[PDB]
Amino acid sequence: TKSERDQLYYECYSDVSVHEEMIADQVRTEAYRLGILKNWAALRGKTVLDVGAGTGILSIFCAQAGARRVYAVEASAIWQQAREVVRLNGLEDRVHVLPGPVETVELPERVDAIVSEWMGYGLLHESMLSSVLHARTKWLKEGGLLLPASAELFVAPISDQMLEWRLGFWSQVKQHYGVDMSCMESFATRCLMGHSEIVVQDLSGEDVLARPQRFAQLELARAGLEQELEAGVGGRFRCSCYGSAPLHGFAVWFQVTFPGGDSEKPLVLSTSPLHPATHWKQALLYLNEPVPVEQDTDISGEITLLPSPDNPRRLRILLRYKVGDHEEKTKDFAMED
Amino acid sequence: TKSERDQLYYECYSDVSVHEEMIADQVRTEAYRLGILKNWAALRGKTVLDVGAGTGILSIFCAQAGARRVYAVEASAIWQQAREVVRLNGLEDRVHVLPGPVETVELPERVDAIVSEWMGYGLLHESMLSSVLHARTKWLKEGGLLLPASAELFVAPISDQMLEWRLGFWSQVKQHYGVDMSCMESFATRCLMGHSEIVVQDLSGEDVLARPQRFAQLELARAGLEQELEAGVGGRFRCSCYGSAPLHGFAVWFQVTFPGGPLVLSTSPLHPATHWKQALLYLNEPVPVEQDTDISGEITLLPSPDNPRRLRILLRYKVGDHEEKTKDFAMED
Amino acid sequence: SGXGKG
């Protein structure tokens, strides 16, 4: 039900813990602060719409960069906290916290820029991007600024060292307690790998088994992007493994890019396992069991990110993949609750 | 509905992660191992029922203690894994995995001893003790052994350093990003403290604000224990604070004791951490306390009306000269 | 862990 689903989604942002997690993510929050500041020349003395303003922090960054008027639109009850944060910082004459969905807000003017932090796990979980695109079409002046301006999706095959340790735990029990439990390994593999949920977990370079590849890109100014979201975002990929390891599946992550403005140097916010950890971690797609691979084993496939039929805000990923000389396989995943 | 609820409960143990967590808990697993093996004199050549045998590990310890036979009863689908574990260890001749609830299993014979790891968060969440007591009445021989034999419940007032950090986070935003968010602290306090859920979280001794107080003791052989569980187990407590701190509420924890062959498995914050952590009961907001501030109260652990396996805690408390207050908590999901 | 889980 939409009244329930959307209402409950916005109510999840009315609690402190999610905002604590987002604002405690210094990689994310500083990237926005600096990406906004990089665009001082387009923002100073100009007007901004903040889509999904939360506690108001990004709208405040825009005012500190010199924006004349910021419309901070927030559909959850957290807008009331944003109103107090804005006043606490001496900004209520310029930054206007507006309750409700951006889809129905009525601003007194089109704006020079939109800022929004709309990205969920696996980039598109929560399905907020459509709201930003709706706001761009309705409210952004021609040639106006979008912050960030684009997103890119990346994949790499992985050998998850933590998963390997959890599966190997059962073969270690005998040395610790004198009871052989090595026969539990197949059961543990079915439980931890055989399900069909997208798993949000932090990896490192030690887990990455081949050079990461971009498999899709989302340029927010593009008119056709809304319908691509409905049909599925993604693409084919092909890589060659660095070395021998048990292949456990794939990690999907994203980056977003802020235009460089006067500096002519764009700022990239990345969620790669090769870069500092963020609250988004990575989105892990486990195969049903490990598959041994070696140096120069080719792995290919196709990944599609779709809204789930049951809940339009729940990310589904359809994976098709081929490891080496093995048969083509498929697996259909949905975001873990 | 009871049949669907019991099936869902047993199913929650059919997944590997909970068994991994329990067996990876070295404090718990070593304590049960030693509690069993140190009872070799009473188990040698005797028969054992393992109530809720899980993967079968405790049944194997009983065999190592010298048991002549172990009936390992397990209601979740994990019984299939226990049967494989028993075979891999060469013990199918003397450890017999029997699937299903212990309340309806048909054992071949009464037993000399029961072993069971039945404790939930806050000791009684899951309400598995009644199953062990049912098995004792039905299957334990006169004078038979129960491992563990007793449980004790403790409470202490706490100043949760992690909660303090989370509440103070909002006053630190200005230093990180140049935006003052200190006004969020009251909102954060309502969100994190103002609910009525029991929070399972691990504390350290640093968080304990007064000498812990034992408020109940459960001798598992004692007559009528079943009906006490339904009516609520608990007791009154009083204590005096160590020093000045914001009181955030109370922590409840437990220990169990094995006949000595006495070995105690503790879940106290003052002892090594276990997967049970502690059960935290937060007041609606912090209350300042000082050295020798007196705190008294009463704690009752009950089944929740809506779900007999969900722990409810009724708290009455009085801090110093403040008025007596109550708060009614139910286990977080 | 719980962003957008609503």
Side-chain angles (χ1 to χ4, degrees), chain A residues 14-17 19-20 23-26 29-30 33 55 57 60-61 64 78 81 84-85 88-89 166 169-170 177-184 187-188 191-192, chain B residues 14-17 19-20 23-26 29-30 33 55 60-61 64 78 81 84-85 88-89 165-166 169-170 177-184 187-188 191-192:
Chain A
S14 72
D15 178 72
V16 76
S17 291
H19 296 286
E20 184 189 331
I23 294 176
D25 179 349
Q26 299 181 8
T29 300
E30 190 93 322
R33 194 175 53 79
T55 59
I57 190 171
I60 295 166
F61 292 159
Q64 296 172 325
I78 201 72
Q81 283 62 51
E84 290 311 311
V85 171
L88 177 59
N89 287 270
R166 293 187 65 189
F169 173 83
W170 297 105
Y177 302 122
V179 178
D180 196 348
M181 307 191 69
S182 64
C183 58
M184 284 279 287
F187 171 77
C191 295
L192 299 185
Chain B
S14 71
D15 172 74
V16 75
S17 293
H19 297 284
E20 183 189 330
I23 291 173
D25 180 345
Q26 294 163 229
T29 302
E30 293 189 328
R33 179 178 177 276
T55 61
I60 308 306
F61 295 151
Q64 295 183 326
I78 201 72
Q81 282 59 60
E84 294 167 0
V85 171
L88 181 60
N89 286 271
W165 184 91
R166 294 189 65 193
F169 171 81
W170 298 105
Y177 309 113
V179 178
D180 193 348
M181 303 189 73
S182 68
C183 58
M184 292 276 287
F187 168 76
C191 287
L192 296 183

